[PDB]
Amino acid sequence: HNGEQIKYEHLNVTSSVSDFLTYLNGRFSNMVLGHNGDGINEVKDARVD
Amino acid sequence: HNGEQIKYEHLNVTSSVSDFLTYLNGRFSNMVLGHNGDGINEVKDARVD
Amino acid sequence: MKNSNDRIILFRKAGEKVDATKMLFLTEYGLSHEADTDTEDTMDGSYNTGGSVESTMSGTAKMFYGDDFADEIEDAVVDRVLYEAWEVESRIPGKNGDSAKFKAKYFQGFHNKFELKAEANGIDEYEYEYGVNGRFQRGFATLPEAV
Amino acid sequence: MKNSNDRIILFRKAGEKVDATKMLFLTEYGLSHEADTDTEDTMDGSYNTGGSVESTMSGTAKMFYGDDFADEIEDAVVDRVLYEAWEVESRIPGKNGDSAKFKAKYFQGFHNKFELKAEANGIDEYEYEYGVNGRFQRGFATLPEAV
Amino acid sequence: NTGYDHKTLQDRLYHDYSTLDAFTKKVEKAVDENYKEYRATEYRFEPKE
Amino acid sequence: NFSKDDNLIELQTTSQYNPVIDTNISFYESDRGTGVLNFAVTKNNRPLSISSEHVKTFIVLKTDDYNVDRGAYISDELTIVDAINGRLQYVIPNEFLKHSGKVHAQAFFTQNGSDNVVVERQFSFNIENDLVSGFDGITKLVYIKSIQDTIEAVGKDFNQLKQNMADTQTLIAKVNDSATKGIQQIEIK
Amino acid sequence: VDNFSKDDNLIELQTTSQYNPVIDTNISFYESDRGTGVLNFAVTKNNRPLSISSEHVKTFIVLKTDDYNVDRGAYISDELTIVDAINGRLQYVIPNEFLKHSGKVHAQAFFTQNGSDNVVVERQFSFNIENDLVSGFDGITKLVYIKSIQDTIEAVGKDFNQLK
Amino acid sequence: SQYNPVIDTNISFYESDRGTGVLNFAVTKNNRPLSISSEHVKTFIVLKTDDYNVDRGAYISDELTIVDAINGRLQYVIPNEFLKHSGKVHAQAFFTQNGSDNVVVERQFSFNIENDLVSGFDGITKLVYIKSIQDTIEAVGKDFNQLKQNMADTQTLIAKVNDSATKGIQQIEIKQNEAIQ
C-alpha cells in the first residue's frame, strides 16, 4: 500500500499516515531549527484577524 | 500488514512507514529543548499547519 | 586460575546405581570435542556440512595397592560395558539449594582404550580413553565422603 | 614490532546481538589460510586450478573461575552453533571518525574443535580451532569497557 | 470549539483544522457526486444496461 | 574551496566512561582561519539534534604546557551547521596557533532557562610547528570568548536600540514619502 | 529526566539474598555537568521486575564519596523519583553538589516499608566522575570576567534608565 | 544529609560589624586564616538594595581592603552615599586564592542597613564555589539577564510603535495598488 491510503483516526479526526508523519517531521524540524523569541508579542499580534 | 509492506514517499524520500516511525522516535528521543520562556517553545510548535 | 588438581573425575557403571568412586593420582587429563565438517563444493557457492562430533577424554593416572578401579576399567574396555562419568569442578557450588553439589559435566559412554606402562624402579601408570557417546549434560553433582 | 599480546580476539553468537566478550589468557594464537591448488596436466601446457581456501584459526588459553566462556565454546563445538569473531589489532585506530574503533578482521563460522588439558600442579589450558566459513572482511571495530 | 481540553495549542489547532477540512471536503465530495449523478441521469449512454 | 574541513570527530553524549582519545588531528603553526574542527554529537548511538535557540554550546581548549608564566587556554562558542544531524564545526582561532604541541579539548553544552550543562569527551588534539615562525607568543592567553562576546553583544544591542529609538521619529516621514510615491505612480500610469 | 541528560545507564539492582558483592560500574560524569546526572536503576527479585508504588514501599538512595570525613567528603540520602511502578524503573537525578567533588563516589539503595519499620537494601556500586578542563584551568580570569560583567551591567544600567 | 566540599576554603562575615557598615570579613583555609597579598589573591564585592523597581538602585561593585592579611581579615568601608538606602541590601562577596586551584568562593547574604549605618546584620547567609566555567556567567547572571530582558522589553515596545506605522505603510501600498487597477 501507498502511505497516503491508510487512515489514522484520532478523536473525531481523520487523516492519512503519510500526511501525519510529514506533520510530525515538520513539527520536529520547526522546534529544532525554527527561530524563536518574543512569544508574548507574537500572541498579542496573532490576536488580530 | 506489518508496516514494512507500506510505502512512504515525500520530497523524493521513499522509505517504509515502519522504518520512518523508528526514525521519528529516534529524533524525538534525541531532541533537545530549552526553557526559553513561558510559552516560547509552545508557540514555536504551533507555528506549523 | 584453576589449578588442574581441582578438577575431580568420577566414573561408575550404569547398572550399579549404588556404586560410586573416583579416579586417583591423575597426572594429565584432557577432554576433546572434534567437529567433522567437510564442505562439499557447489557451483553457486559452498555449504558447510554439519557432521557428528566424536568427543572423547584421555587421562593418565597411577596404580597402587589399595585400589582396583583401574582393573575395572581394563575390564570394561574388553567386555565393552557401559559406564558414565562426571567431570566436576570443585570450589564451584550451586546457586540456590545446590551448594553441596558443585558444577559438573555428565556423560555416558564406553571406555575405548586402556594402556598401562611400567618402568624399572618406578610406579606403573595406566592411561585410559573414554568415548562420551553423545551430548554432554551440565548441572551440579555431589561428591562422596566430602572429598 | 607488534608484541603478540597486542592482538585482541573477540567472539559472540550471531543470535545474541547484545552479547559481547573477549578471549582471555591466550598463550599461542595462530591464523591460517590454506589454498587448495592442484594443477592437472595438459598436453599443450598446464593449468593451475583455483580451489577453495579453508581458513581456520587455532588458539590456546587458560581457564579460570571468573569466566565460563570457554564452556560456551565447548558447548558450541558440540551443538554446532554459529559464532562470529573479531581479530582486532589494538593501537591501530580509524582514519576519519573511526578512531575509537581499531583495525580488525571479522569472520563468521563455527568452532570446529575444543580440547582442554590438565597437568598435576598446574592451571588447565583449553585450545580451540575455529573455521572461518568464507571470506574474512576487514574494517574497524570498537572494544568493550575500554579494554 | 467542541469543548475538549488538549495538551497543546498545536494539537488543538490541528484537530480543528482537520475537522473543518474534512467538513469542506465532504461538502465538495457530495457536490461532485450529485453533479456526476445528474450528468449520468441526463446523458446515460450505457448500452450494457 | 581550500581548507582543512576533511576531519571529523564524534562526541558520545553517554555516561559510560568514554576515555580520552588521540583524534590524530595535527594542524600547523602558520595556519590562520583555515583550521577547522568538525564535531558530530551522538546521544547513545545515533546523532543528537541541536540548536542555537534552545541550547548554547561552547568548547574549552588547553595546551599541555599550560603554566602561569607560559601556556595557552580558551573557551569559545561553536558554529552549528546541519543541527538536526547533530553536526557542527569550530574555526580554530589565530592567537592559539602560536602555541604548539599537544592539546586537550572539551565541548560542553548549556540548556537555556535551566543552565544545566553537559560535558562529552575531553578529547585530545595536536598542533605542529612549521618553518614560518620566529615570533614567540610565550604570553599565556586566557580569554572567555563566551562571556566576552556576551558583553559585546549586550553593548551592541543597547546601541542598536538607541539607533532604533532615534529612527522612530523618521517613521512618519517614511509613511508620507511612501504615500506620495504611490500617488505619483498612480498618476503616472 | 529531560531528553538532554546522559541517561544511558541501566543498573540491575536485584534483591537477591544469595550474594551481590559490588558493582564497579563503568560510568562517568566529568564533574562539570552539575545540572543533569541521571541514574536509571532497575529492580528485580530473582529474575523478574518488581511492582513498587508510592502507597507501597518508599524509596531512598544514599551517596557517599570515597574519602568521607567530618572535615572533608560528602554523604547524603535522598529519594529516587520513581518512573514506572511496574517494571521497577527509578530515575534519580544526581545533585548539583557532588559533581563538584571530583573523584570516586560509592552509592547504595534503600527501600522502606510504607507503614512498618521493615526495609530492604540493594547492591552497592561506584560511579566514578572524572575531572574536566571546564572545572579548572584558572583561578583569576573567572573573577576578572565576573568583575568585568558587573562593571558593564552597572554602567549600561545608567544609560538604560536614562533612555527609558 | 551533610556536605564537606574538599577545598577547605571559606569566607565568613563578622557579626561584630554592626557599626558604621565596616564589613569585616575573614578567610579560613584548612581551618586556618590564610595570609594574603595584593598579588597572591583577588577579591570583589557587589551590593544591591531591596527590590527597587528601577529608580533607586544602590547597585555598587568594588574591591576589598586588606586590613590584616597575616590574620586573614578583609575590611570594606561602606560609602556614605550608599548607606542612605535604608532598604535591605543584599550582598555578594567573592574571594579567589589563585593557588593553582580554580576556587572562587562566593558568599550570598544580606542585612537591614539603616540610613545611619549597618543595622540588623541578619539573614540566612549561604556560600557557593565557582568550580566550572558556566556559572561565572550565572553568578551575576540573574540581574544580568534581568536587565537584558528589560532592554528587550523596551525594544519590543519600540518595535510595536514602529509596526503601528508599518501597518499604515502596508495599507497605503495596498490601497494604491488597488486604485491603479
Q: Do chains C and B touch (3 or more CB pairs under 8 A)?
A: no
Provide the pairing of β-strand G105-112 with G10-14: unpaired
The answer, for B46 touching chain G at a CB cutoff of 8 Å, is no
Cell numbers found for residue F174: 517614511
F85 three-class SS: helix
C125 — phi, psi (to 5°)? -120, 135
Alpha-carbon separation of residue E18 from A6, C72, E15, E23, F29 (angstroms)? 16, 89, 5, 8, 61
Alpha-carbon separation of residue G31 from C128, D38, F10, G101, G128 (angstroms)? 63, 66, 20, 7, 10
F182, H172 Cβ separation under 8 angstroms: yes
Nearest to D65 by CA among D8, D122, D123: D123
The whole-angstrom separation of Cα H41 and Cα H46 is 18
Cβ neighbours of B42 in E, within 8 Å: 8-10
The whole-angstrom separation of Cα G26 and Cα F16 is 5
D26, D60 Cβ separation under 8 angstroms: yes
Cell numbers found for residue F46: 545515533
The whole-angstrom separation of Cα F19 and Cα D22 is 20
The whole-angstrom separation of Cα F29 and Cα F95 is 10
The whole-angstrom separation of Cα H139 and Cα G150 is 10
| Dihedral sign, Cα of residue B40, residue B45, residue B46, residue B47 | positive
Cell numbers found for residue B31: 531532541
G21, G89 Cβ separation under 8 angstroms: no
H163, A41 Cβ separation under 8 angstroms: no
Contact H155 F178 (CB under 8 A): no
Q: Residues, chain G, total?
A: 164
D118 three-class SS: coil
H161 — phi, psi (to 5°)? -60, -35
F51, A32 Cβ separation under 8 angstroms: yes
What's the DSSP call for residue A4?
T
Interface of H with F in 114-143 (CB under 8 A): 132-138, 141
Q: Which chains touch H (3 or more CB pairs under 8 A)?
A: A, F, G
Single-letter code of the amino acid located at H2: Q
Cell numbers found for residue C68: 582396583
Pick among B27, B32, B33, B36 to test the F interface (most F CBs inside 10 A): B32
What does the radius of gyration of chain G's CA atoms come to, in whole angstroms? 21
**Within 10 Å of residue G107's Cβ, how many Cβ atoms?**
22
- Give the angle F155-H62-G145 at the CA atoms, nearest 5°: 45
Nearest to C48 by CA among D105, D12, D49, D56: D56
H100 — phi, psi (to 5°)? 65, 20
Nearest to C132 by CA among C54, C73, C70: C54
C143, C8 Cβ separation under 8 angstroms: yes
Provide the pairing of β-strand F73-77 with F142-144: parallel
The answer, for F84 touching chain A at a CB cutoff of 8 Å, is yes
Contact A42 B42 (CB under 8 A): no
Cell numbers found for residue D64: 579460570
Single-letter code of the amino acid located at H91: A
Minimal Cβ distance to B24: which of A3, A25, A36:
A25
The whole-angstrom separation of Cα C51 and Cα C105 is 22
Provide the pairing of β-strand H22-29 with F73-77: unpaired
CA dihedral F81, F86, F87, F89 (to 10 degrees): 80
Please report the DSSP string for F6-34 in residue order. Answer: ---EEEE--SS---------EE-SS--S-
Query: Up-side HSE of residue C96: CA atoms within 13 Å toward CB?
Result: 4
Contact F108 G134 (CB under 8 A): yes
The whole-angstrom separation of Cα H180 and Cα H171 is 14
Contact F53 A29 (CB under 8 A): no
Binding residue numbers of B for Fe(3+): 1
H91, H111 Cβ separation under 8 angstroms: yes
Q: How far is CA D124 from the centre of its chain?
A: 21
- Give the angle C5-C6-C10 at the CA atoms, nearest 5°: 90
Q: How far is CA F64 from the centre of its chain?
A: 22
> Smallest CA–CA separation between A36 and chain E, in Å?
16
Cβ neighbours of F174 in H, within 8 Å: 165, 169
H130, H106 Cβ separation under 8 angstroms: yes
Grid cell 541517561 is found at: G7
> Smallest CA–CA separation between E17 and chain B, in Å?
9
The whole-angstrom separation of Cα D94 and Cα D99 is 4
D13 — phi, psi (to 5°)? -75, 145
What Å resolution does this PDB entry report?
Answer: 3.7
Cell numbers found for residue F181: 510615491
**Within 10 Å of residue D45's Cβ, how many Cβ atoms?**
7
D139, D73 Cβ separation under 8 angstroms: no
**Percentage helix, strand, coil for chain H under 3-state DSSP, each rounded to 5:** 25, 30, 45
Q: At what angle do helices H141-180 and G141-163 cross, to 10 degrees?
A: 50
Alpha-carbon separation of residue D68 from B49, C96, C146, D61, D120 (angstroms)? 59, 19, 25, 13, 22
D100 — phi, psi (to 5°)? -60, -30
Residues 6+ apart with CB under 8 A from C74: C114, C116, C126
> Smallest CA–CA separation between G135 and chain H, in Å?
4
Closest chain F residue to A33, measured at CA: F51
H123, H110 Cβ separation under 8 angstroms: yes
Beta-bridge partners for F37: F90
The answer, for F14 touching chain B at a CB cutoff of 8 Å, is no
| Dihedral sign, Cα of residue C22, residue C23, residue C26, residue C28 | negative
Q: Which chains touch E (3 or more CB pairs under 8 A)?
A: A, B
Alpha-carbon separation of residue F64 from F19, F56, F67, F100, F102 (angstroms)? 17, 27, 9, 9, 6
Give the largest Cα separation in chain B, rounded. 44
Closest chain H residue to F166, measured at CA: H158
Nearest to G39 by CA among G78, G75, G68, G66: G78
Residues 6+ apart with CB under 8 A from E28: none
> Smallest CA–CA separation between B48 and chain E, in Å?
8
Grid cell 498579542 is found at: A44
Grid cell 510595536 is found at: H160
F105, F61 Cβ separation under 8 angstroms: yes
F161, H151 Cβ separation under 8 angstroms: yes
Single-letter code of the amino acid located at H32: R
Minimal Cβ distance to B34: which of F43, F47, F111:
F111
Which segments within chain C are labelled E, that is strand?
A: 7-12, 26-34, 40-41, 46-47, 56-62, 82-93, 102-117, 125-131, 137-141
Query: Up-side HSE of residue A26: CA atoms within 13 Å toward CB?
Result: 13
Contact A35 F83 (CB under 8 A): no
Cell numbers found for residue H52: 527597587
> Smallest CA–CA separation between F55 and chain A, in Å?
10
Could you tell me where the DSSP H helices lie in chain F?
A: 145-167, 171-188
Alpha-carbon separation of residue G58 from C75, G53, G92, G120, G123 (angstroms)? 68, 8, 14, 10, 17
The whole-angstrom separation of Cα H17 and Cα H26 is 12
Residues 6+ apart with CB under 8 A from F142: F73, F74, G137, G138, G141
Contact H5 G97 (CB under 8 A): yes
The answer, for F62 touching chain G at a CB cutoff of 8 Å, is yes
| Dihedral sign, Cα of residue F26, residue F122, residue H96, residue H112 | positive
**Within 10 Å of residue D81's Cβ, how many Cβ atoms?**
14
The whole-angstrom separation of Cα G123 and Cα G62 is 12
| Dihedral sign, Cα of residue G131, residue G137, residue G140, residue G142 | negative
Interface of H with G in 132-151 (CB under 8 A): 132-134, 136-137, 139-140, 143-144, 147, 150-151
D146, D102 Cβ separation under 8 angstroms: no
Cβ neighbours of E19 in A, within 8 Å: 12-13
Alpha-carbon separation of residue G153 from C7, F152, H60, H156 (angstroms)? 78, 12, 11, 20
Contact H160 A41 (CB under 8 A): yes
Contact H5 G70 (CB under 8 A): no
Grid cell 582519545 is found at: F21
Contact A14 E18 (CB under 8 A): yes
What's the DSSP call for residue F35?
B
Q: At what angle do helices A18-33 and B17-29 cross, to 10 degrees?
A: 20
D129 — phi, psi (to 5°)? -120, 130
Nearest to G129 by CA among G42, G4, G26: G26
The answer, for A15 touching chain B at a CB cutoff of 8 Å, is no
Cβ neighbours of F7 in D, within 8 Å: 96
Cβ neighbours of F73 in H, within 8 Å: none
Cell numbers found for residue H84: 542612605
D34, D53 Cβ separation under 8 angstroms: yes
F153 three-class SS: helix
Burial F56-90 (b: 16+ CB within 10 A, else e): bbbbbbbbeebeeeebbbbbbebebeebbebbbbb
Q: At what angle do helices F171-188 and H141-180 cross, to 10 degrees?
A: 20
C33, D111 Cβ separation under 8 angstroms: no
Minimal Cβ distance to C53: which of D78, D116, D122:
D78
Grid cell 618406578 is found at: C122
The whole-angstrom separation of Cα C114 and Cα F38 is 70
Q: At what angle do helices G141-163 and F145-167 cross, to 10 degrees?
A: 10
Alpha-carbon separation of residue D55 from B38, D108, D130 (angstroms)? 66, 11, 9
> Smallest CA–CA separation between A29 and chain F, in Å?
7
C59 three-class SS: strand
Nearest to A45 by CA among F161, H164, H165, H148: H164
